[PDB]
Design an enzyme around this catalytic site. Structure first.
Site, PDB file in Angstrom:
ATOM      1  N   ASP B  31       1.049  -1.262  -0.032  1.00 16.43           N
ATOM      2  CA  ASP B  31       0.063  -0.012   0.057  1.00 16.43           C
ATOM      3  C   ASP B  31       0.974   1.307   0.046  1.00 16.43           C
ATOM      4  OD1 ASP B  31      -1.496   2.255   0.692  1.00 16.43           O
ATOM      5  OD2 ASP B  31      -2.743   0.963   2.037  1.00 16.43           O
ATOM      6  N   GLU B 123       1.897   1.366  13.158  1.00 13.56           N
ATOM      7  CA  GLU B 123       0.747   1.481  12.439  1.00 13.56           C
ATOM      8  C   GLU B 123      -0.162   0.605  13.041  1.00 13.56           C
ATOM      9  OE1 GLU B 123      -0.592  -0.463   8.965  1.00 13.56           O
ATOM     10  OE2 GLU B 123      -1.950   0.390  10.442  1.00 13.56           O
ATOM     11  N   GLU B 132      -9.535  -3.993  15.872  1.00 16.67           N
ATOM     12  CA  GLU B 132      -8.278  -4.863  16.263  1.00 16.67           C
ATOM     13  C   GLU B 132      -7.917  -4.378  17.398  1.00 16.67           C
ATOM     14  OE1 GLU B 132      -4.873  -4.702  13.536  1.00 16.67           O
ATOM     15  OE2 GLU B 132      -6.191  -4.507  11.734  1.00 16.67           O
ATOM     16  N   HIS B 280      -5.573   0.356   1.578  1.00 18.44           N
ATOM     17  CA  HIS B 280      -6.114  -1.050   1.688  1.00 18.44           C
ATOM     18  C   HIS B 280      -6.984  -0.839   3.068  1.00 18.44           C
ATOM     19  CE1 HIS B 280      -3.313  -0.826   5.176  1.00 18.44           C
ATOM     20  NE2 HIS B 280      -3.655  -2.044   5.757  1.00 18.44           N
TER      21      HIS B 280
END
Ligand code: SFG
Ligand code: SFG
Lengths: 8, 343, 343, 9
Positions: B31, B123, B132, B280
């Site tokens: 990406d 990230e 997440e 993405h």
């Protein structure tokens, strides 16, 4: 989740 | 540890399994918007790295630590909890950076670090920013951070806006309506129609779309990673009041996010906005089981509520109403289980 | 229980969560060849069902138990371990069949039946037949079967055959050569290229293909469900000797399967072969990391060895050689992590 | 596995 980041 | 209290052991295994694959690290790495933006953020703010100590939370392949190294940092602790940490160590060796980058396998909640760091980089953004629950690991990691030390990214903006897209609505509706058949191979399925609509509309839609579908300026929710506690993300309440700019059916809310690297030299933004080149993360839409009719000039008000769960995601509730009519929509979404619609 | 003995709790949780989705039941239900053929096998063998006692192992939505009802069965015990059981119950009520179909929530290895059955029906076939390990549950259910009772399906045939597909093969390196870059944003990724190749080669490929890739007639491995025991499926050794019908580079083995319902009136087949219309099982291909040159007339011999694991799947080991030359290739694959290539 | 049954057209 099951697929936390999916394809680009 | 804070991590496993938070997390179903099962979820943690599967999660870190997924990031254990090279193909998935490749997917993130290629990406170019993401990878190049991070590189610009770090390289352009070279003084925030020159001779500093750095923590990389979830280093994956190590790519971000390599950037920190390129910007002239003294030592970089590269923490990674998946088996990808082995592969990262290989790369540090093959790139002859054993004296600057130290892979420390393990969850950042659980490992020990030789010293306090001047800056943390990660990230940790998921779909809709918060998927997440990695942002809680990133915030947790501030226990290693020095006074007036920095976070990269520094802040994250979640944007939401109402949209109209009848083709998307109908596509999901048509699937659910499989369960309205009265004689599928002779069998009456119709008693499950309601349950089916619930299940399908529970799934958020991950893909991109044209900005023309949006019906009102977005509302912004900001998280300041310098200041926030990881408990701040247990219960995320986002009130909204949209001033509708077009008439039509509102089929749901669309979501995206930006992050800002507030450097000493300059700020650099990474945006997943639908006005910006594709990443993405795409964008995310939460559909209403029954769309709401709105006139230009109406106000669409309510609340989006994200309850953090033990499967490393959020239960989302979105309650909206058109004030001028009292027409209301209440919805519950399962962020862990999106419908990846793209292409 | 027998089930929990051979199954990691977390694998089971994921598995029954998946089948707890109406959307996933629907996906199977909508496979017309699948669902239509089941119905036809049952109805055309009406004497095997008229006034009989039936056990539907893993009844899901109920669909097969409704077909057993349509053929005149007196009593059908419908066992289902996922939360789909509660939905199945709703359908039984709404189809006014509460005195003929009894839904029993749970694992067939753990529940009780109030009597023995004349016939057992199930759809427990995974891709490559064996994935999911549910055939063991179908076999385990025979404890409920009257002497001389029947099983629908009655037997399963797995087919193996060599294929040539130079492009499929080369695509693995294409993907892996992502890592063969001396300066990806300044980072030498080269050292991981071999590992990336190995990762891709471990995944069986699920899609369909043109039968012209097949270089020899298939050999089949048969499982007789009337006679087999569960333990027969813990280690599945499939010897092969192929008579090569075409010269070329052999890149792997292709897999498909058929089941037969051997009734009193007729035998009906359900095939997932590449010669037949497509099913949601597609077909399965396992590559060799080193291809083998053969010529029409040569013999390609070896073994495909499937070793059950605790995540409801198998470790695949394939060893093959061209006899005339003694050129040889050996490969290890993870059946539970396939590459779903199709469209 | 994650998705034991595959999605059909
Ligand atoms: N609590 C944690 N401790 C250590 N690593 C983690 C934790 N949570 C997630 N990770 C890892 O963080 C990474 C998240 C990735 N999105 C980032 C990878 C890498 N930094 C990159 O930018 O390409 C994954 O490799 C996860 O395995
Ligand atoms: N040990 C077990 N006990 C009970 N149900 C099971 C077991 N293993 C798998 N299942 C269920 O069996 C079903 C298998 C499905 N392929 C078939 C569903 C349905 N019979 C149909 O043909 O449409 C799934 O619903 C599983 O949840």
């Amino acid at each position: 989740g099951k697929a936390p980041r999916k394809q680009l | 540890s804070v991590f496993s209290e938070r997390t179903e052991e099962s979820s943690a295994v599967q999660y870190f399994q997924f990031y254990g694959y090279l193909s998935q690290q490749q997917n993130m790495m290629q990406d170019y918007v993401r990878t190049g933006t991070y590189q610009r953020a770090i390289l352009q703010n070279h003084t925030d790295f020159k001779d500093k100590i750095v923590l990389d939370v979830g280093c994956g392949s190590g790519i971000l630590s390599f950037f920190a190294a390129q910007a002239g940092a003294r030592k970089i602790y590269a923490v990674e909890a998946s088996t990808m940490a082995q592969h990262a160590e290989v790369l540090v060796k093959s790139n002859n950076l054993t004296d600057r980058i130290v892979v420390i396998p393990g969850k950042v909640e659980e490992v020990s670090l030789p010293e306090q760091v001047d800056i943390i980089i990660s990230e940790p953004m998921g779909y809709m920013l918060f998927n997440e629950r990695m942002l809680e690991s990133y915030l947790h990691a501030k226990k290693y951070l020095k006074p007036s030390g920095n976070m990269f990214p520094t802040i994250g903006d979640v944007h939401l806006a109402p949209f109209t897209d009848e083709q998307l609505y109908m596509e999901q509706f048509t699937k659910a309506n499989f369960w309205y058949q009265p004689s599928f191979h002779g069998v009456d399925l119709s008693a499950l129609r309601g349950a089916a609509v619930d299940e399908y509309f529970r799934q958020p839609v991950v893909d991109t779309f044209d900005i023309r579908i949006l019906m009102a300026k977005s509302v912004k929710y900001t998280v300041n990673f310098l200041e926030a506690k990881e408990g701040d993300l247990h219960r995320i309440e986002i009130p909204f009041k949209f001033h509708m700019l077009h008439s039509g059916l509102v089929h749901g809310l669309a979501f995206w996010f930006d992050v800002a690297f507030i450097g000493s030299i300059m700020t650099v933004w990474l945006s997943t906005a639908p006005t910006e080149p594709l990443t993405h993360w795409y964008q995310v839409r939460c559909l209403f089981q029954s769309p709401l009719f709105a006139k230009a000039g109406d106000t669409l008000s309510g609340t989006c509520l994200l309850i953090a769960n033990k499967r490393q995601s959020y239960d989302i509730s979105i309650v909206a109403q058109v004030d001028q009519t009292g027409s209301k929509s209440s919805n519950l979404l399962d962020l862990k289980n999106p419908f990846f619609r793209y292409t």
